[PDB]
Design a binder for this molecule. Sequence first.
Ligand SMILES: [K+]
Ligand SMILES: [K+]
Ligand SMILES: [K+]
Ligand SMILES: [K+]
Ligand SMILES: [K+]
Ligand SMILES: [K+]
Ligand SMILES: [K+]
Ligand SMILES: [K+]
Ligand SMILES: [K+]
Ligand SMILES: [Mg+2]
Ligand SMILES: [Mg+2]
Ligand SMILES: [Mg+2]
Ligand SMILES: [Mg+2]
Ligand SMILES: [Mg+2]
Ligand SMILES: [Mg+2]
Ligand SMILES: [Mg+2]
Ligand SMILES: [Mg+2]
Ligand SMILES: [Mg+2]
Ligand SMILES: [Mg+2]
Ligand SMILES: [Mg+2]
Ligand SMILES: [Mg+2]
Ligand SMILES: [Mg+2]
Ligand SMILES: [Mg+2]
Ligand SMILES: [Mg+2]
Ligand SMILES: [Mg+2]
Ligand SMILES: [Mg+2]
Ligand SMILES: [Mg+2]
Ligand SMILES: [Mg+2]
Ligand SMILES: [Mg+2]
Ligand SMILES: [Mg+2]
Ligand SMILES: [Mg+2]
Ligand SMILES: [Mg+2]
Ligand SMILES: [Mg+2]
Ligand SMILES: [Mg+2]
Ligand SMILES: [Mg+2]
Ligand SMILES: [Mg+2]
Ligand SMILES: [Mg+2]
Ligand SMILES: [Mg+2]
Ligand SMILES: [Mg+2]
Ligand SMILES: [Mg+2]
Ligand SMILES: [Mg+2]
Ligand SMILES: [Mg+2]
Ligand SMILES: [Mg+2]
Ligand SMILES: [Mg+2]
Ligand SMILES: [Mg+2]
Ligand SMILES: [Mg+2]
Ligand SMILES: [Mg+2]
Ligand SMILES: [Mg+2]
Ligand SMILES: [Mg+2]
Ligand SMILES: [Mg+2]
Ligand SMILES: [Mg+2]
Ligand SMILES: [Mg+2]
Ligand SMILES: [Mg+2]
Ligand SMILES: [Mg+2]
Ligand SMILES: [Mg+2]
Ligand SMILES: [Mg+2]
Ligand SMILES: [Mg+2]
Ligand SMILES: [Mg+2]
Ligand SMILES: [Mg+2]
Ligand SMILES: [Mg+2]
Ligand SMILES: [Mg+2]
Ligand SMILES: [Mg+2]
Lengths: 145, 152, 110, 118, 50, 100, 221
Amino acid sequence: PAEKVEEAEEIGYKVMGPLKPSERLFKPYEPVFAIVQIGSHQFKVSNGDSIFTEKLKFCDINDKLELTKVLLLGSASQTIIGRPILPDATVHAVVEEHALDEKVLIFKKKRRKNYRRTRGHRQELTKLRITDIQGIEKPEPKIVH
Amino acid sequence: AYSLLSLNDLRDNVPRKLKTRKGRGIGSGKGKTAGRGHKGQKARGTMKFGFEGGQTPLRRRLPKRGFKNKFKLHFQPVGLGKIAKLINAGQIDSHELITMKTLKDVGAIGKQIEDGVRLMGRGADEIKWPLHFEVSRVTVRAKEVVEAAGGS
Amino acid sequence: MNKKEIFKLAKGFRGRAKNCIRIARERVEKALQYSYRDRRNKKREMRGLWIERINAGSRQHGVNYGNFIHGLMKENIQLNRKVLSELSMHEPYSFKALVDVSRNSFPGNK
Amino acid sequence: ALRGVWQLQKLVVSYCNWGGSSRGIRAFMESELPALIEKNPQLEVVTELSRGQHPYLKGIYRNRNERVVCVKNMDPDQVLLNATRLRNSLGRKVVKLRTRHVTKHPSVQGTWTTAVKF
Amino acid sequence: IVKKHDSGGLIWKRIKLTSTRKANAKTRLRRVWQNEAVLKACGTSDAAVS
Amino acid sequence: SGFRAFKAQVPIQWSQSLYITLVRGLPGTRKLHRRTLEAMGLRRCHRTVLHSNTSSIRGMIQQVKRMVVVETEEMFKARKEAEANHKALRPPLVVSHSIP
Amino acid sequence: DRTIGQYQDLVIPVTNFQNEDKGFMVLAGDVFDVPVRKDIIHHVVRWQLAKRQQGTHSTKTISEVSGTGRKPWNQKGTGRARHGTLRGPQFRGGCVMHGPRPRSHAIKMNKQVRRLGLKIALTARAAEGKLLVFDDLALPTHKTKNIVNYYNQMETTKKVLVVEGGPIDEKLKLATQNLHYVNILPSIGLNVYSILLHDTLVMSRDAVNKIVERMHTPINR
RNA sequence: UAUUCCUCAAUGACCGAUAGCGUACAAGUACCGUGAGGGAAAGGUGAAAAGAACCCUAUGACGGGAGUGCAAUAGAGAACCUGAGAUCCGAUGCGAACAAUCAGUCGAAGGAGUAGUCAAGCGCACUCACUCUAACGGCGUACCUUUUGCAUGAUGGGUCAGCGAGGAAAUGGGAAGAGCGGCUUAAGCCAUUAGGUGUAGGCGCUUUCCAAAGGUGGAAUCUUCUAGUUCUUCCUAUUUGACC
RNA sequence: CCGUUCUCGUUUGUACAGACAGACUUUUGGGGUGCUAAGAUCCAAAGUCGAGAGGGAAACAGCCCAGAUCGUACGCUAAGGU
RNA sequence: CCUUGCAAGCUGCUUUUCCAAGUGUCAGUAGCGGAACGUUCUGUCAAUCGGAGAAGGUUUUUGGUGACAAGACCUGGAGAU
Ligand SMILES: [K+]
Ligand SMILES: [K+]
Ligand SMILES: [K+]
Ligand SMILES: [K+]
Ligand SMILES: [K+]
Ligand SMILES: [K+]
Ligand SMILES: [K+]
Ligand SMILES: [K+]
Ligand SMILES: [K+]
Ligand SMILES: [Mg+2]
Ligand SMILES: [Mg+2]
Ligand SMILES: [Mg+2]
Ligand SMILES: [Mg+2]
Ligand SMILES: [Mg+2]
Ligand SMILES: [Mg+2]
Ligand SMILES: [Mg+2]
Ligand SMILES: [Mg+2]
Ligand SMILES: [Mg+2]
Ligand SMILES: [Mg+2]
Ligand SMILES: [Mg+2]
Ligand SMILES: [Mg+2]
Ligand SMILES: [Mg+2]
Ligand SMILES: [Mg+2]
Ligand SMILES: [Mg+2]
Ligand SMILES: [Mg+2]
Ligand SMILES: [Mg+2]
Ligand SMILES: [Mg+2]
Ligand SMILES: [Mg+2]
Ligand SMILES: [Mg+2]
Ligand SMILES: [Mg+2]
Ligand SMILES: [Mg+2]
Ligand SMILES: [Mg+2]
Ligand SMILES: [Mg+2]
Ligand SMILES: [Mg+2]
Ligand SMILES: [Mg+2]
Ligand SMILES: [Mg+2]
Ligand SMILES: [Mg+2]
Ligand SMILES: [Mg+2]
Ligand SMILES: [Mg+2]
Ligand SMILES: [Mg+2]
Ligand SMILES: [Mg+2]
Ligand SMILES: [Mg+2]
Ligand SMILES: [Mg+2]
Ligand SMILES: [Mg+2]
Ligand SMILES: [Mg+2]
Ligand SMILES: [Mg+2]
Ligand SMILES: [Mg+2]
Ligand SMILES: [Mg+2]
Ligand SMILES: [Mg+2]
Ligand SMILES: [Mg+2]
Ligand SMILES: [Mg+2]
Ligand SMILES: [Mg+2]
Ligand SMILES: [Mg+2]
Ligand SMILES: [Mg+2]
Ligand SMILES: [Mg+2]
Ligand SMILES: [Mg+2]
Ligand SMILES: [Mg+2]
Ligand SMILES: [Mg+2]
Ligand SMILES: [Mg+2]
Ligand SMILES: [Mg+2]
Ligand SMILES: [Mg+2]
Ligand SMILES: [Mg+2]
């Protein structure tokens, strides 16, 4: 348990629990962005986006996640640069799907030497849905009549 | 499967090893020249085993020797140790004459006697009784050991 | 490989290379070799594109790519080239802030 | 599950009680199917008998998609693994992933144009 | 290396001695110089306790 | 350059232990040198082995000195410590651009 | 229950075709209680079927295919591939290269291994509860309704193998020659494949005694 | 005891129309040769012919309707069950007369056609929605064989469909598995809805050097250790045409 | 005689092989023959191709760097370059 | 795949599995070794499927490292394992 918690923290996520049907987490678009690193890949996301990361081994469907490695925060007014990360910034996500991709064909052949091989490969991926970006001063809910 | 012997689940101790069918595709590992290499006489399959290349062979450079005796006699060897073991086993009567028929019936002599029985001196330290033998040949040690115990 | 599986991969081939098995088997294998090689060449092509966009964004304010990326290395800013190029394309003021920070870190010679 | 809505709705398990290719899926039903049903309340599990045919798992999704996995001559662990793969998927078509980051607003401060002043 | 640039039909082009090649060669020399310095400094005696 | 990360930050003195790192490739070399590296325990490029400072190892390193980087205990500790200290965390910067 | 393979004697009730109680018989332990191994059964069955196979298959070689031995054209000059006949192995209407010729498919086995396989089969049929022992196989008539009524009376059965100690009684021969699910055999014809074909084995006292005596008589060599 | 120009009955882990006899069909025919001689091709409507009366357009129905029939592209005159591919002629969408190359692969503006989900107010944005095409950019000198080495201006192939080359017996050298403890039968004999018997023989025990006569103490000291043979599968060798 | 390698890569019984047509490069600064000619030819010591893809040498078997289990629109370097 | 632990059975108390760690290994011609897919026929089979539509053919979707396998529509009209 604590092993999975610490290794998922080294990768860059934290499991916060399943999603209840009463919760309404999918608010509309707000103009802030955050840059999160999950493993080796870095994504520049806003709320409402989706990403396809590598297979995360310690999360299930409809799990709320908190992405603990935020490298940059930005809005229309100011930018917060993490050197290397921001300990105060927080990005909320929801796990959506673990799925295999389309099969690619690995074909090797050496001409006039009587040698060829074929083999397929399917790589698994995890889809995340970004819900919230915290740490930078958001604009107010602006009903500008 | 409670002691079930059906014709639907019979199998052997190990899986059956199948034939190596040469001359099929690339992936079998034994296609396009099978296992024969490129050209020559051993790929056309016209080579006789034991040929040496035109050099005079070892089977013709070495001398012949001797002759064959068509009247050679073959005697089956029995040691004293086996006879003593069968005495202690209670299968050979120690007080009667030990002929060749006794040895053939007990099994100290193999399936085919040819010309008789030769008595050997192996296991001569197990003889403790005066035994009487009737064999075809006997060695010096065996006769000395028997007559030292008092037999003939 | 099957005959029908080759006829599925030769779909869209010009000429008799989509009907005849002798002609379609040669052209499909070349396509598979090209796909295997381009799975490695795509990474170099994309990284070169990122360097071109980062350099084009940075030279607008008078800082070269070679000075800019080493300034961000010196300030322990670990944004990679893909994210930096996306920032240069879509967030010009945050990229200008990063260029100013890198210029204060490593101005270089000249 | 797309935005909290579970996409897999029906899991059909088609087997045969006589043929030898259904031994794995048969033993899967006594062992792993009740645990899967208990941990999946929103999912409907249907059981079908088809004598003299090969067994399969059919998943029916919300976007009117059916995905069939034949599970002949398999082990219960492989059958359970493919049932989990059916549950975890959104039911989208199996084609190449064009992009790994899907967004509708690519910029907050506005995309760089030629008429941008600083 | 190949030093045949004036004969045959097989063209082995002569490699120039440019400043980039000199800059690489100096770095190789610096690495081997540091290796020689480490070995010279540590070759006064043998470390004890086998 | 690549030797920049290996240039020494500590004066070179006598040491009890040596760290040998392989920085050159295998093909195109003598099989005598390849077997010497194999007896040192180096099989792949950018691999590091630890040995004690005796003449039996010094002769091997002197044979293959153009393919490896040899470091003492203090130099290895300084390199690793400086790398970790450079990757240590710092307080963030906040920049307000505004007025487009 | 029991464990099978300890070479213990078994006791069995005896009946007849009229479902009467006629006593008990002790079966020999070294015939009806041997360990059950499947590989020996597999080998004996393979030996039986290979001995049964007839093997009259035949194709023609180039010495038998009707056709002349003349060269079809010149060696050189025509512009076609060189051929020696028009009955080659790749020709249409040619010979069959490496095709079959009539031969026997029989293999060998040891007598004691065949005996061990017979013991294993009888042991399994005794341990399953599918062995029924009769006092006699005598019948009132040769009509087949007697056997049909008895088979309908029997429980949990598809096919029955009946073994008689000596030659078959003529009434028993005539009553069962139209039923494909009841088959008869003498004791001298008892074998592993026909034991395994039918899931129920019905023997008489003389069949049991002759089988046990044959197993207890060692092979004369 | 040997053989089958012949007759009767039975069987097949024998073939199934490029197979099986050269011949499933009027074949030693047609055809080729002066002659001896060589020597093919070609199976199938439908359960039953009920095989399409009649009308229209053509010189003429094999066409378009009508009717029989479960079904009519199931409509034939030594051929109509199913009806693949090379090949030929059309229709719809996109590309295509200022741009070159084993004709693809990795990205990709645009054009064209079509779906579904449901919370909120019956819109609209969600499914990277899905399918076809691809202006433009980067990269890319076929395959086999033989060779030190082939884009090679070295060999071979017009394309498609079907066919086409490591296989059988007996005896040897071994490996894996099993039976028995000495092991195992060959010809034969008695029965076959099927097995059982048969000791002649072979190997081992066994004795080691030797041309032949001749000659022959294994180990261990501490309740003693002291031999193999026969099948099955697979890889190789010899004799046979011996991968073609 | 002693260290390092922890790998048997060593010796040997049994069974199955293939191959016995090699090429180029290291100052003509290891040499013989030739004209101190050859992409000639014959030996000694290394490396590569043979049987080896990837980056540089415009193009390139044999030169320089370096050894391809698979996936990624992640990072650091070699030969060589800006 | 190997190596080392850990846990089970074994008989072998030492050879097989499960799990974890491995800055351990995985280019390949001649050649050698291991493991599998498919075709025709046979036993299981007087058993199972079939006008609730067999074999065969054209599309399309799904699975496996691969030879390949399987779901559905259209055609087809009686066999398949
Ligand atoms: K000149
Ligand atoms: K002739
Ligand atoms: K014919
Ligand atoms: K033929
Ligand atoms: K029809
Ligand atoms: K292109
Ligand atoms: K020519
Ligand atoms: K043999
Ligand atoms: K044995
Ligand atoms: Mg090979
Ligand atoms: Mg070939
Ligand atoms: Mg060979
Ligand atoms: Mg050869
Ligand atoms: Mg050849
Ligand atoms: Mg040759
Ligand atoms: Mg030239
Ligand atoms: Mg050149
Ligand atoms: Mg200069
Ligand atoms: Mg450099
Ligand atoms: Mg002839
Ligand atoms: Mg002639
Ligand atoms: Mg010939
Ligand atoms: Mg024929
Ligand atoms: Mg014919
Ligand atoms: Mg036909
Ligand atoms: Mg025909
Ligand atoms: Mg005439
Ligand atoms: Mg008419
Ligand atoms: Mg019909
Ligand atoms: Mg067509
Ligand atoms: Mg058109
Ligand atoms: Mg144009
Ligand atoms: Mg042109
Ligand atoms: Mg594409
Ligand atoms: Mg498009
Ligand atoms: Mg559109
Ligand atoms: Mg080009
Ligand atoms: Mg030549
Ligand atoms: Mg060669
Ligand atoms: Mg070339
Ligand atoms: Mg050519
Ligand atoms: Mg040409
Ligand atoms: Mg030629
Ligand atoms: Mg030609
Ligand atoms: Mg063909
Ligand atoms: Mg020679
Ligand atoms: Mg030579
Ligand atoms: Mg030479
Ligand atoms: Mg030289
Ligand atoms: Mg020289
Ligand atoms: Mg020269
Ligand atoms: Mg030369
Ligand atoms: Mg050499
Ligand atoms: Mg090599
Ligand atoms: Mg190369
Ligand atoms: Mg290259
Ligand atoms: Mg190039
Ligand atoms: Mg490798
Ligand atoms: Mg760099
Ligand atoms: Mg390999
Ligand atoms: Mg069908
Ligand atoms: Mg079958």
